[PDB]
Amino acid sequence: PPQSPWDRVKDLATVYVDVLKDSGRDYVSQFEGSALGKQLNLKLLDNWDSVTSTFSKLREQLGPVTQEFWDNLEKETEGLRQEMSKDLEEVKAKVQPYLDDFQKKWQEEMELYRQKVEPLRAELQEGARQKLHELQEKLSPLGEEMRDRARAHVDALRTHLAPYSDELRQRLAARLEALK
Amino acid sequence: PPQSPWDRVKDLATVYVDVLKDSGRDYVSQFEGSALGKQLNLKLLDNWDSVTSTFSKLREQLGPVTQEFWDNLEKETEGLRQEMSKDLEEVKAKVQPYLDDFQKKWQEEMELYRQKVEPLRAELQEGARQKLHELQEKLSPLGEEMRDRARAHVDALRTHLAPYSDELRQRLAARLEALK
């Protein structure tokens, strides 16, 4: 099984084109994955990816190429990487405010939602706590009493059974002695 | 490695003597293991077992025996099993009321404890439920709103980024075309 030379073009697409939308996707994941985003069970990345990949659009455009192309690509790779890398940074810059504004906005949204929710939730949790604190004290002496009685009941049983186990052991011993 | 002939005596001790206290232990486990017994974390069987086993007390009593003993024991085994089995049932009978009364008493105890506890616990669980029912309705429309906005924000970002990914793909395509 040989390896397609087009893998080199695929790598250039991933590294220098799709990185832009992937970073976009990562900013969205941070929203989806936040403590509050999970609270809401946000699923937001359906249809995020376009159907046709950047790689397909490149191969489709370049059309078929010769071995001269691949030898020329291998010749220019480092100089093309350098120049592609500066185009990528010039675009990353242009796009960064959108990503910044998105990150700040969903956090604003979540905070504004936390304010409407966390207080009412805190309250109920507080009162539930204070009513439970008021109940682990009433059943507290009730517990150490049941345990004392339970222990007394078991010691009584253990004691009641003892003479009967002795009687059995003595009947066995006497039957065994008869085999001497 | 040979096997001790005394294993036969050990088996008789287990089967026809220790079964009595073991059943006792099983009645206690039922208490310990009940839904309410677990609630209280009952640990009740410490020191239940005597230090010296019935087997040790039998061997200690019989003292050393001959091969004639083991041949005689093998001769009488079925007739000794039958007769030991009827002694065991005559004792099981004598002891059963104790086990019955113990089982009935710890259940009485647990019920009497359930009455003091379950109501107060039910109440708090009811009100906590009714206050939460009163809160999953207020944040309900708030949730479907945040989701709509979240979806709108992500579609905006996806859209803002598109022309920049196209520009990158076009700069790569043009650099690749130059290698033809």
Residue A2 is classified by DSSP as -
Is B25's Cβ below 8 Å from some Cβ in A? no
Q: How far apart are CA B38 and CA B36, in angstroms?
A: 5
- The structure tokens listed for A49 are 């990816």
Cited resolution, angstroms: 2.2
| Domains identified in chain A and CATH numbers | 1-136 (1.20.120.20), 137-180 (1.20.5.20)
DSSP B14-67: IIIIIHHHHHHHHHHHHHHTSHHHHHTT----TT-S-SS-HHHHHHHHH-S--H
Q: How far apart are CA A45 and CA B124, in angstroms?
A: 42
- The structure tokens listed for A15 are 């590294």
Of A158, A164, A154, A168, nearest to B94 by C-alpha is: A164
Quick one: closest CA in A to B132, which residue? A124
Chain B residues within 8 A of A73 when measuring between CB atoms: 176, 179
- The structure tokens listed for B146 are 């945040």
Angle at A131 between CA A129 and CA A133, to 5 degrees: 65
Give the phi and the psi of residue B45 in degrees, each rounded to 5.
-105, 15
Residue B13, judged by CB atoms within 10 A of its CB (0-12, 13-18, 19+), counts as buried
Q: How far apart are CA A54 and CA B166, in angstroms?
A: 9
Interhelix angle for B19-32 vs A140-177, to 10°? 170
Q: How far apart are CA B83 and CA A175, in angstroms?
A: 9
Chain A residues within 8 A of B106 when measuring between CB atoms: 150, 153
Question: Contact B103/B27 with Cβ under 8 angstroms?
Answer: yes
- The label of the residue with tokens 């007769």 reads B83
- The structure tokens listed for A121 are 């939730």
Chain A residues within 8 A of B153 when measuring between CB atoms: 102, 105-106, 109
Cβ-nearest to B164 among A28, A95, A105 = A95
Give the phi and the psi of residue A40 in degrees, each rounded to 5.
-85, -5
3-state SS, one letter per residue, for A47-103: CCCCCCCHHHHHHHHHCCCCHHHHHHHHHHHHHHHHHHHHHHHHHHHHHHHHHHHHH
Q: How far apart are CA B169 and CA B172, in angstroms?
A: 5
Q: How far apart are CA A109 and CA A37, in angstroms?
A: 10
- The structure tokens listed for A108 are 């604003």
Element (H, E) at A34: none
- The structure tokens listed for B117 are 């506890």
Q: Do you know the residue count of chain B?
A: 180
Residue B121 is classified by DSSP as H
Element (H, E) at B126: helix B67-132
Q: How far apart are CA A138 and CA B119, in angstroms?
A: 13
Interhelix angle for A19-32 vs B140-177, to 10°? 170
- The structure tokens listed for A102 are 């998105």
Instruction: Work out the end-to-end distance of chain B between its first and last CA atoms, rounded to an integer number of angstroms.
Output: 86
- The structure tokens listed for A125 are 């949790």
Method: X-ray
Q: How far apart are CA A163 and CA B72, in angstroms?
A: 29
- The structure tokens listed for B71 are 């041949």
Residues 6+ apart with CB under 8 A from B128: A124, A128
Cβ within 8 Å, pair B95-A147:
no
- Residue A62 CB-half CA count within 13 A: 26
